[PDB]
Amino acid sequence: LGDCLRNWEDLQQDFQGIQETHRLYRLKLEELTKLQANCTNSITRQKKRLQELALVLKKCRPSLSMEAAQELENQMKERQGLFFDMEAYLPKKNGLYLSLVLGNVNVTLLSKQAKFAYKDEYEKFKLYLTIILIVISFTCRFLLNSRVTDAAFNFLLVWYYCTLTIRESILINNGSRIKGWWVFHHYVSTFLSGVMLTWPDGLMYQKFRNQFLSFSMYQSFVQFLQYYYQSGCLYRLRAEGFQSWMWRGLTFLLPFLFFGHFWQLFNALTLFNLARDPECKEWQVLMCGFPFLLLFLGNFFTTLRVVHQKFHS
Amino acid sequence: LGDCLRNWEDLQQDFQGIQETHRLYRLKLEELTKLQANCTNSITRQKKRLQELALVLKKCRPSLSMEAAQELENQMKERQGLFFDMEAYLPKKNGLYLSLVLGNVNVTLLSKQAKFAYKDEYEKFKLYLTIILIVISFTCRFLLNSRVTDAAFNFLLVWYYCTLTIRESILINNGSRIKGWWVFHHYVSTFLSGVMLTWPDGLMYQKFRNQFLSFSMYQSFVQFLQYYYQSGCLYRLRAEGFQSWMWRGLTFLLPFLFFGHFWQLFNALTLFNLARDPECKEWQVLMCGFPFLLLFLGNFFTTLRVVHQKFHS
């Protein structure tokens, strides 16, 4: 007891200060929420008015002695630009997909330190899980051929893509701007790995395994390159010649990304050629073919856009 | 231009104040993070010391003129109780599953208003998606029998359970205390819906469809009752006789929850009885049987514990 009584009295002294510090923290927690409320309401209100006057300018654009109108348009371009900056700091309401999963919790990371550190943890997840795909997909093609192991690799893909969607819809809400297609692509590929999962073994499977498992290897290996491309881009973006690195970086990368897009079409063509063969008699082939064709029409098109912008700017 | 010039000068006046308000908000944002840092470090430090002295008391418990030791133990029970209160307010590091999915973003909802409003949105998600399960599972059993529609219902289950895991690992981190088993149960049932997905049609399937689809209906209908039980509990918890409602509420509910547990074992027994039949010759049956047996051993056991605590307290 002698020690048991002694520790309490001094521990009580230190506990007292900790109790009072938390009392102040509760105050500045609530006062900051009110500051979050007013500031959020103020910007969204003024953004509405200027958009109306921007609409007014839009209707008054033919009203063109018009040099101010172009400059006020630049001024409107400036004002909308600044409001897009501040709102990145304030909490933003979740989108649609983040209301189904993860619920209505504010996932907005305030400081730029966090907005940076999260982007790298997103990359370090794409790489770390990619090599696990290569190892398993390499085994399924060369070492062991069975429906159970191909189901284990396919279930990993359905999880890898569905997880990457949540880790991207946060980045859109966090303040970054990923192209509209990439979020949609992560769905079609999931639905693609869905139909393949319920394929029944037969003659149709052993004619569409090598062309799918090998393609899963090459696309996975390309992901290694995009890492060394984007990781190099982000660190420099944190800090002219960088634009040369950006152009030269995409230059070495574009052939491989186009090679994959043409392979994607070639796997699509096989299925339609395999389906029209009478011996197939499986519903799953033709509904598996369209995602492959759909992915090619999107990827080859969207990749051309980001390059056209790169040459333009 | 006359209107185009006029709006800017007054809009500039209002924009000025909004610019300065955001300037102060940036200050109290950072000062609160430092307050979050110090307060979080202070409690976790003192929690360690008292745990050591609690360990010291643990080793000095046989040292028993011991009435203070019991009271200091109560004092230790009080101190640990208070620290569990404050830390619920401060941000807490993500667990393990929330590091794989959703990344390292603070999902801690500070005010008690949010900690309450999230719990109801979790229930309102369990109900809203349950009736969609009943409608589809009712169709798959009576209206239409096909491998494609049963795959559509099964994929919905794999998503419904995997989504409920994220919406629960947040509640554990948010401050609630869900039993350890319930988070694990949402995995085994997912793995159960996994093996059934790769079942190949044959003689074994049409002998294990009615006993699974109907069981999926009854378990889904029970979920309607748990809603009217928990929703009634939470609203009263927000505010003696309530304990009578709690005891009477579980009393009417316990028979149905036990009826389901015995059905779970009965479906498990069929598979082992079906597997030992030579005509099956499918790997998926016996690996599908153990989850059904595993779920019964857990559910019937854990449900008995929460009732034993209810009678005890």
Residue numbers in the entry:
A (entry chain A), B (entry chain B): 9 to 72, 76 to 250, 262 to 335
From the paper:
TACAN, originally identified in a proteomics screen and called TMEM120A, was categorized as a nuclear envelope protein (NET29) that participates in lipid metabolism. TACAN is an α-helical TM protein that forms a symmetric dimer. Each protomer consists of six TM helices (S1–S6), which form a barrel surrounding a tunnel open to the cytoplasm. The TACAN protomer is related in three-dimensional structure to a fatty acid elongase, ELOVL7.
Alongside the functional characterization, we analyzed the structure of TACAN determined at 3.5 Å resolution using single-particle cryo-EM. The two protomers of the TACAN dimer bury an extensive surface area of 3049 Å2, mediated through the TM domain as well as two long N-terminal helices that form a coiled coil. The TM domain in TACAN is indeed similar to ELOVL7. In addition, no enzymatic activity was observed for TACAN using a free-CoA detection assay (for details), which demonstrated robust activity for ELOVL7, thus TACAN does not appear to catalyze the same reaction as ELOVL7.
